[PDB]
């Protein structure tokens, strides 16, 4: 019942990224330093590279939560410019108004 299949794929990416966040964090700490031996860091590189692709947080996309628009989104409200304006122009967004100066 999500807007489209692309939103459903991002929902699953956010879920899998949340489940592997602690593991990826711990493995990454082994790689992000010059203290541990290279032999141990090379093994950590292979370990984090073997985790599922959809656990990587860079693949998450901030889509409009009502229309799934992938661009033109305002992060504070998580709405696309078109949907945001529709609500703002009907006076349904508390404290938001047209700007003239």
């Amino acid at each position: 019942h999500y807007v489209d299949w692309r939103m459903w794929r991002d929902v699953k990416r956010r879920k899998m990224a949340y489940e592997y966040a602690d593991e990826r964090l711990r493995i990454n700490s082994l790689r992000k330093n010059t203290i541990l031996p290279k032999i141990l860091q090379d093994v950590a590189d292979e370990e984090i590279a073997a985790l599922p692709r959809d656990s990587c947080p860079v693949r998450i996309r901030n889509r409009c939560v009502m229309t799934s628009r992938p661009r033109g989104v305002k992060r504070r409200w998580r709405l696309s410019r078109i949907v945001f304006r529709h609500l703002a122009d009907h006076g349904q967004l508390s404290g938001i108004q047209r700007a003239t100066w």
Binding site: R85, D89, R98
Partner: protein
């Protein structure tokens, strides 16, 4: 030409309410906001969550009181209280209004985990501000 939230001129037979008769550039000048909360103030959080809740409450009430709403809802938040002020018509019997009030307040309280109240003001007919 601009279109957003503008009821366009007609033959003089279209009744419009005060809210519908004002374009977006009159917000904060001649008309207030339909929802009041602290989410959009500087340094405040959770504006996104308050927005989704408002959009749902407006659709819920529209379909829960079908053909009864005579104007847009006014949503107010104080602390963790949620007040819903609606202007309805005088066509449904009072018994059905009391049923729907008790039903909607209870259902929304369990859905959003907060005390919800619904205040109804009845009017004999849709208040007309002008005929466009």
């Amino acid at each position: 030409k601009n279109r957003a939230a503008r009821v366009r001129v007609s033959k003089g037979d279209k009744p419009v309410t005060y809210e519908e008769a004002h374009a977006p550039h009159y917000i904060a000048h001649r008309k207030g906001w339909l929802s009041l909360h602290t989410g959009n103030l500087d340094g405040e959080d959770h504006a996104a969550e308050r927005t989704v809740e408002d959009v749902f409450l407006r659709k819920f009430m529209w379909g829960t009181f079908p053909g009864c709403l005579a104007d847009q809802l006014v949503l107010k938040r104080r602390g963790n209280q949620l007040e819903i002020c609606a202007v309805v018509l005088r066509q449904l019997s009072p018994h059905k209004y009391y049923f729907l009030v008790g039903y909607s307040e209870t259902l929304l309280s369990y859905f959003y985990k907060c005390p919800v109240r619904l205040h109804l003001q009845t009017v004999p007919s849709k208040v007309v501000y002008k005929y466009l």
